[PDB]
Amino acid sequence: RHMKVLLLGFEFLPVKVGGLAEALTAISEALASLGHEVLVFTPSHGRFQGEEIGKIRVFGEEVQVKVSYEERGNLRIYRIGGGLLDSEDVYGPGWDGLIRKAVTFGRASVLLLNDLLREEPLPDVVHFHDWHTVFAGALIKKYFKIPAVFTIHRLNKSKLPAFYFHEAGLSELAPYPDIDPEHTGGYIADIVTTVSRGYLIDEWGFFRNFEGKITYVFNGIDCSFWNESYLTGSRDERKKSLLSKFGMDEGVTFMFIGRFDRGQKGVDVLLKAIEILSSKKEFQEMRFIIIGKGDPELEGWARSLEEKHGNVKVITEMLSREFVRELYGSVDFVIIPSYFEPFGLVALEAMCLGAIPIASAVGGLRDIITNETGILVKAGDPGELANAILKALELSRSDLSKFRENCKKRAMSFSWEKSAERYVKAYTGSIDRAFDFIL
Amino acid sequence: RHMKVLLLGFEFLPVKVGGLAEALTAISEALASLGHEVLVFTPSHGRFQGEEIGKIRVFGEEVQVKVSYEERGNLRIYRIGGGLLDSEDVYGPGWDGLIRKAVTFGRASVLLLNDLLREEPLPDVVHFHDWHTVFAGALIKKYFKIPAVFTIHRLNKSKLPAFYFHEAGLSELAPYPDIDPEHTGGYIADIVTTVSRGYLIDEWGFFRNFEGKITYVFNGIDCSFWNESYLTGSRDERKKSLLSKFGMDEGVTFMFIGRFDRGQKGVDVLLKAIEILSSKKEFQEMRFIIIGKGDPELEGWARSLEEKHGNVKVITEMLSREFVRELYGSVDFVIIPSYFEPFGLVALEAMCLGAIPIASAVGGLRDIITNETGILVKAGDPGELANAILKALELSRSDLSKFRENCKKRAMSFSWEKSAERYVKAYTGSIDRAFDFIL
Amino acid sequence: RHMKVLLLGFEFLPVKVGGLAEALTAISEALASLGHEVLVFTPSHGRFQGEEIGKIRVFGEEVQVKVSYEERGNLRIYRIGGGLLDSEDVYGPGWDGLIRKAVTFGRASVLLLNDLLREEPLPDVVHFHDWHTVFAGALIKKYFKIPAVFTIHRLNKSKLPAFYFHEAGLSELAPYPDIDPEHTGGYIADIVTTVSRGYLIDEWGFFRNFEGKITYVFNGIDCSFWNESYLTGSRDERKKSLLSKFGMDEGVTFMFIGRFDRGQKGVDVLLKAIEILSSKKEFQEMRFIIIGKGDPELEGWARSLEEKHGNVKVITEMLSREFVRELYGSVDFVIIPSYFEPFGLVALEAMCLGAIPIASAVGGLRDIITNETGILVKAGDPGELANAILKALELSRSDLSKFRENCKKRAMSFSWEKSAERYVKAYTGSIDRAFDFIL
Numbered sequence A, B, C: 001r002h003m004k005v006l007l008l009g010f011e012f013l014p015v016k017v018g019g020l021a022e023a024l025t026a027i028s029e030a031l032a033s034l035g036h037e038v039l040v041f042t043p044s045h046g047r048f049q050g051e052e053i054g055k056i057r058v059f060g061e062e063v064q065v066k067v068s069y070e071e072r073g074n075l076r077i078y079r080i081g082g083g084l085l086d087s088e089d090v091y092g093p094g095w096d097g098l099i100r101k102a103v104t105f106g107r108a109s110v111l112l113l114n115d116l117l118r119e120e121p122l123p124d125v126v127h128f129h130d131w132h133t134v135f136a137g138a139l140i141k142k143y144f145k146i147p148a149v150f151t152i153h154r155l156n157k158s159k160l161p162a163f164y165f166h167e168a169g170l171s172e173l174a175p176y177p178d179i180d181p182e183h184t185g186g187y188i189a190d191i192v193t194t195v196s197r198g199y200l201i202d203e204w205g206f207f208r209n210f211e212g213k214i215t216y217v218f219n220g221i222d223c224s225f226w227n228e229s230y231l232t233g234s235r236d237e238r239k240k241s242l243l244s245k246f247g248m249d250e251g252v253t254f255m256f257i258g259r260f261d262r263g264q265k266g267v268d269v270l271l272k273a274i275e276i277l278s279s280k281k282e283f284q285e286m287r288f289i290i291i292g293k294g295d296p297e298l299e300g301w302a303r304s305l306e307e308k309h310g311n312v313k314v315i316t317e318m319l320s321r322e323f324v325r326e327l328y329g330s331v332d333f334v335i336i337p338s339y340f341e342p343f344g345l346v347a348l349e350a351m352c353l354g355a356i357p358i359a360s361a362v363g364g365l366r367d368i369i370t371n372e373t374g375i376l377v378k379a380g381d382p383g384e385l386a387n388a389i390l391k392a393l394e395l396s397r398s399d400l401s402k403f404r405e406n407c408k409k410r411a412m413s414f415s416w417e418k419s420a421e422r423y424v425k426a427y428t429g430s431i432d433r434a435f436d437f438i439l
């Protein structure tokens, strides 16, 4: 039954950059709750000031390794400091520093584990996440010979000069002048995983190289927070109240939240879709809340539509989670026009608070959304999005209470416990995997 | 101690071409009797109609894979249908039909395992039997990386085109235009086994290639089934009753139960042996029952002797295992004049039920039969076979009850439990093996 | 754990050549006491009666293998005879003969393990000691695929011709014309160990080749025997009684217990130091007892000093093991001027009995002797040894009583039990090791 897991993560709470830190801490906590002893190795990034445990040679220079320690139940956390690991720029400083930081983290992890084997047994598996932890996972695999699992949360698609592999003591893994560290991590790993079944299919051109040892393991949502119990009144009352705060009157309400960028979150597709619809008679029946920032040309374009249309509103700030929870619980639909999506947490967050997703049929959004829980659409096509929005409006005159209930039931099925239980399977190879010849 | 075993066989009761089906069923039940969890994959051959579990691409076409499930204690059987696996011709249709049936068995077996691994732990070993299951054994070894034991029940000694290894997804196993699948099986296996010590010596020219990881595991005999307790009355009473059934009076009885072919079970040597004795005076004081079929020329020749003499009978139709038991318990002797013999399951069936075997001194028959439990003869020689039959008629006057009693006691020592116990040793490597330098 | 251990050693009590025989027996019994099943294979060296267990081919010749069996609780000892294994010359006969004997031990060990695996499980680890057993270790690892651990007690630093590896069935381990068998033993080993941290450091030029899988495991000492409890009277009484036997007065007594012709114990350093001290006034307070025998030139030098000084005593006759215990337990200081010392059992024997060691700072003597337990000197320097002896007379202020108490505490902590436990960590790989980048 019970196992001893070594989890290598390049970021961990309270260090927060993207969504990974939160994701790895949830996995690590969930594993611990199942009764597994979980050890976490992660850089301190200048957040913690630990005790000096030893010295290592890295890039022809001496470096004193420091360690900060926390223990919560079966979870044991180690923040490793020393050299570039004390640099606050989590993914830095610069492309050069980040790679050196990853290499130092690799040799520091071997030092720390080596000291632990002085008083305790070898871990059953080494679970390492993303290309930044590859040097650590490769080194631990190389010397201690324990099973390795590699999880890719998002493909970076970029090669590193052979130089950095030679310095990490992994020369044999660098037979060419440049190496993709995600290909190297998949090569040395026993089982490779990714965060959705759809993303695995979308990026098969790459994942194909690990046919028969590549699988999917879904992330989870904490619908202990994302939940309607924190909201008061009925949905209509909440929706009428929210719209008053925005300075709009009653209408079918659509919501976008995300970065304003190109070929990514698709706010540009949404904006063109609003322009297409603006000539239709049923446009003045629709309400649009667009939240986020980034590309200032897209922010200006977004602010032009707010200026030209009283039923469109834009907010270029990062709102709190409490305020976003109330937004998901008030709006009718959430629009997710992504060009690609590894998982799609925004969908789950909206679905748990009863908002109906209209999303691009890409990556994990295909796995999350179904016929009876939302609308999928062809990605990168404003006309087809505008048409999906028109179809969402006719639905709205019917009782959508069944749609909303199905969303809440489904979203809550994506638990972190289910996610953890399935990693335990991957750790022993007792798991299914992707084969090209299965139809 | 206890292990999850995945057993791959091409033949399984109630499907029955030769003694292979009975061998694989008994092994599987014996493994299960010892407390081990045994999963059997085997083709349906059109005898079982099952539920679809998915689809696979094989030879550029979509093939629907179906499964029929039977649970019987710790033994779990999966008859796999789809494409040529639905063909009623077990070892066909023809040479190429059998090969692509074997390739289909490979990818279908991966699909089923992949699906089982979605809700259960990975098996500790894969035990695959004869060259027909090599595609399945190799694929499961390649991807799932579990220990593999290859057991050869009969050596076919031929090569398949590389085309079929390419189509099976095993290009790295076919570096020439034509490939012996028995060499491939041995190569990729951790421990190779055959069904007797005598056959290992006889075919050392081949087995020599896997020196250091090659051994023998004797087949057994289900003396709980093959027993005189199911029969009633005395032996002479059953003997007289059976002889009168085919329209013959009392007299010493010899039996043959084997497939009609040129250089295998030796029906050609028996028929010519009968022609030598027909000129002699003792022929009228002898009875013959020649059960089997196959080759048209030999079928006509066996049929011709039946027409000439009211002394010889021939049965071509499918006899039950219950009726074959009754024949063994009635007849005085059993002739087993094979050119080669991997084991000799007919020998132990005859001996356990009381009949005295007359066998060729080849392969497993040397291990089974001794001077105190039967008559050994030079293989491929009709003269010495005829000579041994006359020596059998000399003993028929003497109460040879010790032959019958020593046969019973000797046959009982070859239990399937011992065979099962010894296969468990093979699965972990804890078994003795043949070395080139060990004389 | 309760693992099953197969231990390989070229000598084993009662066959004594160096210290290896006693050191392996103590390791084996300690493991047996901790509840592990231990199997020892060792050559008979023409000493013990055995029964034949089969034949092997070596060097184009047929050899009859013989075995003697001894059982002692959980310890099971197999002394393997046959061919050159019947040679009484332990490390012979001659250099070529010794290599052939070592090769014969390889194929004979494979034959014995092969027969044992007919009726018992495969051992969990193969633990082989020094280069003489590398043909056995490598062959067992090759065929049976079980975890290997290679312990170096002493480095011989020579290369053997490729011929011998080809005859041992290990052609793949000899791609060059000449091969260092100590390199070969580490390469094929999963974890390599050596008998001290200090000797690991001294020979890092060699051990660095197995960086990441090389570690140390100290030898031990039997403080059930080397104990003051057996000695009657106080230490003062014993020393005075000792000095009157040898015909001297009271004084600070120094002792040397080592074989002269064993150059590696620097008795010539001591003798020169005594000459340096003889011109000093405080020499008349010193008493010396040199024990051992060897070179006529060196014995003459010792017996010359014995003649010139009533201070000095030279004993060449073979002493009792009980008597040597009483010497350690009544002298003040023991001098160990070794040029090198992988462990330093003599220092522990003195310390466990209260004698304060004055020793060369080489190999395991650095690990055994601390500032609170004894005196470390620069190796091979008579002048620095003379100073150490002078400094010792100052400590003879009566506060060397705490030195003796510290020595007994420290000596006892080097038990064979603690050594056996750390080897068990080595067999699983759950142990700290030496890395190149850990400074």
Ligand SMILES: O=C1CO[C@H](CO)[C@@H](O)[C@@H]1O
Pocket (backbone or CB within 6 Å): B018, B019, B020, B023, B153, B154, B195, B219, B341, B342, B343, B344, B345, B346
């Ligand atoms: O000689 C034989 C060879 O194959 C089978 C074993 O799989 C036996 O049943 C048969 O008697």
